[PDB]
Amino acid sequence: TVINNWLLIEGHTIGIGDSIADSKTYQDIQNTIKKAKQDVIEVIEKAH
Amino acid sequence: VGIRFCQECNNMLYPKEDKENRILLYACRNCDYQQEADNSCIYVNKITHEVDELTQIIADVSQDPTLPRTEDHPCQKCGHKEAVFFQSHSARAEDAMRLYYVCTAPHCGHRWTE
Ligand SMILES: [Zn+2]
Ligand SMILES: [Zn+2]
Incomplete structure (x- = not known):
């Protein structure tokens, strides 16, 4: 009871802004994915 | 035999x-x-059956549009740039991811593994 009635004051939510990171983080994630793709391509070629 | x-x-x-x-x-x-x-x-x-696949590989496979092709490795016979490559494509082939290339261009039909 007391915690719900305090959240009546503070409030809680979820939104689009909660599901997006900074542009630097997006660039880092893209760089990591590109590096992973390059490494797996190199592994495929080495196995070939 | x-x-x-x-x-x-x-x-x-x-x-x-x-x-x-x-x-x-x-x-x-x-x-x-x-x-x-x-x-x-x-x-x-040959229980270990070290069989060569290129003897079981047919030349018309080069006509397949669904198969990848690279100009990197040329034909030994005719020296054509573009050649189609694919894996063993065969069961009970032990453990083999090696590449079997088939030369494109008509009437060539050359095949080689590297
Ligand atoms: Zn008889
Ligand atoms: Zn050729």
């Missing part, structure tokens, strides 16, 4: 032993036919 057929009833020749001369004979049991066995070997068993 192979199978030889009779010429009278066209049945299968089984190996027989010529007791009097001590030579391998192929004698059909459907009739009385007996023939001299040239190879002197009957059965060969």
Whole structure:
């Protein structure tokens, strides 16, 4: 009871802004994915 | 290693032993036919079966639009730039991810593995 009635004051939510990171983080994630793709391509070629 | 057929009833020749001369004979049991066995070997068993796939690879595979092709590795015979490559494509091939290239361009049909 007391915690719900305090959240009546503070409030809680979820939104689009909660599901997006900074542009630097997006660039880092893209760089990591590109590096992973390059490494797996190199592994495929080495196995070939 | 192979199978030889009779010429009278066209049945299968089984190996027989010529007791009097001590030579391998192929004698059909459907009739009385007996023939001299040239190879002197009957059965060969490659249980590890180090078989070459390019002998089982047909040239028209190069006509497949669903197969990848690179200009990196040229043909040995005709030196054509573009060649289609694919894996073993065969079961019980042990553990093999090696590449079997087939040269494109008509009437070439050359194949090679690297
Ligand atoms: Zn016969
Ligand atoms: Zn060629």
